[PDB]
Amino acid sequence: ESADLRALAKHLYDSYIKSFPLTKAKARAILTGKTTDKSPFVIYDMNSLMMGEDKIKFKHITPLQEQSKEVAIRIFQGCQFRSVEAVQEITEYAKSIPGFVNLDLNDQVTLLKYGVHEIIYTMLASLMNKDGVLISEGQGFMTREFLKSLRKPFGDFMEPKFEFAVKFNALELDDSDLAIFIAVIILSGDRPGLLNVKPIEDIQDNLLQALELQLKLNHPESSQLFAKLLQKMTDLRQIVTEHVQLLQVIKKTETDMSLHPLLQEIY
Template structure:
């Protein structure tokens, strides 16, 4: 009958709201119950430990890839921004200092040498700075792509999935990285060789000045979290 059929009894208990453990341990003596629970917990603890070890290994691999691919990580950027470096960045705060910084900064940032330098030098101030920002964006996207390739499991995804993940994740990653190079007074450029003040950027014509100012506002809120390179 139904009371003797363990299967029927099991489902009848479930139907009235009893938990699996209550059904399993309900009529078992306390000593047997404790013994069985202890035996069940051992493999669960081992499984949790193995899972934790796997997560730690994955986090370590991602952190190493991050440090390898990004030339100016947060620790290095903080060193420049707090003056804890042997070569402090050249401060650009007006048109004159921008002119003085151009030969060094543009040559370092642009890969094609004097021809590109001549083109940039002939542009208006906003266009020159936009050209530098454009270079930073392209370089960062390249670094993000190489970083993604180093993340375990990413290269094994379908190529279309890889492209989709990069396409929709690149802006969030870019702004998180850009925030590391900013403080309330300005931002680092040319891998830490230069520092453009916030006030100078705000003095540029719109919409460039508004576009940059919104990035500063985000960076201040993001940096308030005090994340380090391993967190990023």
Template structure:
């Protein structure tokens, strides 16, 4: 998961061979800063939860089962599955973190990840349409290539 590659100061890029600072990210022109900055904010909060691999597996399934993805035709069955996975996530967190009620309340109620996914897909589609017209630094081209 991308959050594991980020901290409050920046993110590892290019398979862990480089580090992009948050200041560098903020200096980028649109849509690059819009693409990555919300993920930094989410990652810092998400990493503070200290979820283990089994927690992450259920959490990621909730994100994958987002009914508001662009191009999705039959939304209701996906939303029903997501509701089931939200219940499973709540149980998983209660079992794995019985002494941390904040974790049990924060993760399931956080509806930001599916929204981030939707925004990410929309921005990537914009990049695909406009990147031919942009004069992009080679380092940024490499980062973008790794994103899609």
């Protein structure tokens, strides 16, 4: 019944607004969108990020550059922190989804183990555009060119993300849309190791239904947007796989150091 889908939709939307600080309406005003009044400290050069964290309240590293731990390394360890953060936000948005907790815990844990990854790149596109990506709650904006002028490893790290974001943003979705789109992702059912897929698919079915009417009523003119949207979810599955390749090569760059232990444990 239509009434339930608009309900489920509104439920998830209000829940999504509570769970995620920096939203897209927001990030879109701060970014290219004018809403000029507060604008975000820019980072384009190696002197720009140098001591840059001045304003910007960073947790982990400060403006130190002189053969003391490479800039590239300290920029990647940053994303990871944010990652660890987002995973928590998401783990909570998950509980908010109708029926999620009523499932087998083992299953709730697996759905997150694999889902947390696609949702992160999905939302990172909310804080990105062809020129750069928003950072530090929105007090930042690290240019795209600066990111590509990074060490040999890290040069392709974020490029395959700006490409996806550019395409994904062309769909022009809003937080009310991504709310449902993101639920659908989590409640996949084809994730490895699940134990009772029926339940997991009954909800996604219900979530998919809601996503459909939502895009209809919310994009009356965008012909076949539902379909194109579900397609972009394949590019996500690929961008996530390719991400562990340039990551595995990292496992073969740092290492043997006894002052890491309680850190490599966190990540």
